[PDB]
């Protein structure tokens, strides 16, 4: 028989993933993302916009 890691079996699987199971997972994922959206929508050093420091084994200790 042909192996599960055969190149021909992989190419047949790649055509299934692109043409048959492709848009079906895309349409389902669109509906799930719309549901997560409904749940979700239901100075720089003083405002925090500019990123500063909070609160060494890469260089030798001088």
């Amino acid at each position: 028989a042909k192996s599960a890691r055969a190149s021909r079996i992989k190419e047949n699987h790649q055509r299934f993933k692109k043409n048959i199971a492709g848009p079906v997972e895309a349409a389902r994922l669109e509906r799930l993302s719309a549901k997560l959206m409904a749940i979700a929508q239901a100075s720089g050093v003083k405002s925090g916009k500019s990123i500063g420091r909070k609160d060494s084994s890469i260089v030798f200790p001088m």
Partner: protein, 341 residues
Amino acid sequence: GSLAFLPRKRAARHRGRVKSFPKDDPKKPVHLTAAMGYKAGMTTIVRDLDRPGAKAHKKEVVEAVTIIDCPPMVVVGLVGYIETPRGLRSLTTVWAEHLSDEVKRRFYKNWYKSKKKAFTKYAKKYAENNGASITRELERIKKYCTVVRVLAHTQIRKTPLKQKKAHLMEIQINGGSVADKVEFGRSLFEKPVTIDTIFEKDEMIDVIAVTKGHGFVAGQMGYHHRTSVNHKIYRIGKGDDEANASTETDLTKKKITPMGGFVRYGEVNNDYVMIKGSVPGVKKRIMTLRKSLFTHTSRKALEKVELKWIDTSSEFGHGAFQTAAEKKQFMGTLKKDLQTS
């Protein structure tokens, strides 16, 4: 045995790790990937099979399914990861106000003795006009991080175990710019997300758990970390329907949980995911449900599933009654109910 699973090693942690989340591209929209639940038991179904080419085409087939009780999660944090030449690493983590008592219990081991002091100074950081630090925390995520995850925890107050601790994990957000998934995760803060939004009916998922341990009759037999792939979801229940187990060709108003309750679990009064076949783990155990890493190459996926009936009869013995009303009507009226009335 198999050398891929040897030596026989106990799982380092009782929960279970996702290890590999699916590969992300920004073209799809934002969606979460993993979820928990707690296993309640198993039951039987009958499915009108819709498989072209099989002998069981267009005839009834009995099928063993599992029931995982999933109360809604609560998003409490957002961790962001940066891509280093030593692997991914967590750059910073942002939490939310008003962490519940159950998620605070996870940080403790003696809750009864310890005064409730975890995240007390962090909550003041939100509210005492140091929200610049929280916005600096989120802006650092938006600028440097390549993937973000959601710290989400389940509520075992509604799940009927004796455990008051909660269970945390990281749930990866995929599908968008790193800026877009930040506003996604920040908006989810202090909010309950449901399993109806995480997965949907007729999709094939992976289950991560620790197996049953065979202690007390050459080494460790059982309690192994297993992830098992390609399990088909047959039904997402909503809990408040009062007809969770009712199908289109069985108009009986009944819930999923059997008569007398699930053995050593109780009644499933929340959202439940009904999955094909067996699942690693035991009753009352935490079950991590995860999306498929790769696009499916099977016709078992893309297969719509319709159900004829769900077995609501008792698993504490041989029972052939689905409801209490059916048992009473068949057995007639008895002398204890005659004396009570």
